[PDB]
């Protein structure tokens, strides 16, 4: 795989070309990236995918150019999903929430990239997306029902005072308070591991390598059994969430609550 | 100083200036590291009046300071975004949930924005991102909606307090335009950071967005208005900003006396206290939560529908434990009480 590919086709259906790019190992990691348009997560997520400092922009793996879209890229059983940025005002909230709820359910860890952490509206979106749930009890292999998805908030293009440990601690506390009652989301309770701050050579990539390593730690498998789900069976799970009827019903009641 | 406390003693602290003609200026902003909301306005006063960060005691309050030299009563809002407010909400009782915790401060920010937009000659929005905050716009739309349903009751209180026939400025308003309010404020916005091309562009955006949320050009249903020619958007440097405010302030001759403004702050406390609202009103997110859980419960009861009562009782619990995020503990206890009831009859 040379560059990203579109994960969805028309009308938010999974592209027919994704299953052929998936191997058959139970050892795979799903990382998604969400956030507003300006934060530059597409370039950041690609750095974590493989790019190496001063490589031509033409060679980046996620280069942004259909209503909803997600970009897919995989190396060494590592699945990276790059969601379209967040935004009629009513329909923009419903589409942003639909993609967010989907990536929370299918990812091990979701990177929440923004220039404005702490941001209540971003936090509001995550905890509402948490409630958009499917019912996949008939799915085999049985799925972990109390599973929590890891969230790593990344403040990009940050200033000198954003790097102050006292400011990061203050903001991380709010982030930990925002998910203390969450059922299927979680943030690290270790200082400086919940809110990552970057400013904007070799010293930069050392963080990406260190961050890349940390994103393999706090994972929780989708399956009840260890190593029971293949990455292709993960794609089957993805089709079953987007199809689940209870999820569809709850999305619609959200759209109604926003227009009312 | 909290506006609620400001009224009780203002009559005597400014006993010598009760006839002075003043303006009332509202201020909307967010706290940042080493930069509070009113750091640009206290800089206009050359007196550090408002804090770098609102403390817990100051959260969800309008903070008033009357500059005697400038004949201006400034109103700075401590909103939902203050670090101290988010700390206070999410620590008061962890036995609650995120939605019900933040909801209360959200409602108070609507009440306080409603307070400002019916009692200020000008309101200035401070924004640091460089893009217009649509979450604020969404708030203002909810403010304008609440205003329309409480204008009739609020207008009754302007009549009872004997302020309805008091002019706020030279502009005349019809009974429909003025119901429940004392003015249609002129809205300004200052962005923190070929410069002329960017102001005209943001001016167009700003007006377009305000129109898109039906906040201007709606007659009596408008929440505010914009100047006709005087700049509305300003680009703060990393004094140009004083001139931006003076051109606005000096376009309107002071009219209303401090004595009537004081009585107005006293009269409009019912807005901040919610004394005119219907009891038990929930936000859009709270109603969304309660609706999906009412459906999730109604569906779980559908699953339970003789000896294998535990069989059909357990499959429903697996559903409620799969889909309910908040109040899940109470949801499970409530349903099984429902299932055991049906499992007897």
Numbering used by the authors:
A (entry chain B): 59 to 123, 134 to 155, 172 to 284, 305 to 364
B (entry chain A): 1 to 193, 210 to 254, 289 to 355, 381 to 420
What did the original publication write about this model?
The SMG1 kinase is an essential NMD factor in metazoans and is associated with two recently identified and yet poorly characterized proteins, SMG8 and SMG9. SMG8 and SMG9 interact with each other and inhibit the kinase activity of SMG1 in vitro. Nucleotide binding occurs at the G domain of SMG9 but not of SMG8.
Using bioinformatics analyses and proteolysis experiments, we identified regions C. elegans (C.e.) full-length SMG8 (873 residues) and SMG9 (385 residues) as sufficient to form a stable heterodimeric core complex (SMG8c, residues 1–423 and SMG9c, residues 59–375) and to yield diffracting crystals. After overcoming crystal lattice defects (detailed in Materials and Methods), we solved the structure and refined it at 2.5 Å resolution with Rfree of 26.0%. SMG8c and SMG9c contain a similar globular fold with characteristic architecture of G domains along with additional secondary structure elements. The major structural difference between SMG8c and SMG9c is the presence in the former of a helical bundle of three C-terminal helices (α7–α9) that forms a stalk-like protrusion reminiscent of the stalk domain found in GTPases of the dynamin family, such as Atlastin and GBP1 (Daumke and Praefcke 2016). The G domains of SMG8c and SMG9c face each other and interact with part of their convex surfaces. In particular, SMG8c helix α2A interacts with SMG9c helices α4 and α3 (patch 1) (in particular Val83SMG8, Ile86SMG8 with Leu258SMG9, Leu261SMG9). In addition, the stalk domain of SMG8c folds back on the convex surface of SMG9c (patch 2). The SMG8–SMG9 heterodimer forms in the absence of nucleotides, with interactions conserved from worms to humans. Finally, the SMG8c–SMG9c heterodimer is formed irrespective of nucleotides, while proteins such as Atlastin or GBP1 dimerize in the presence of GTP analogs.
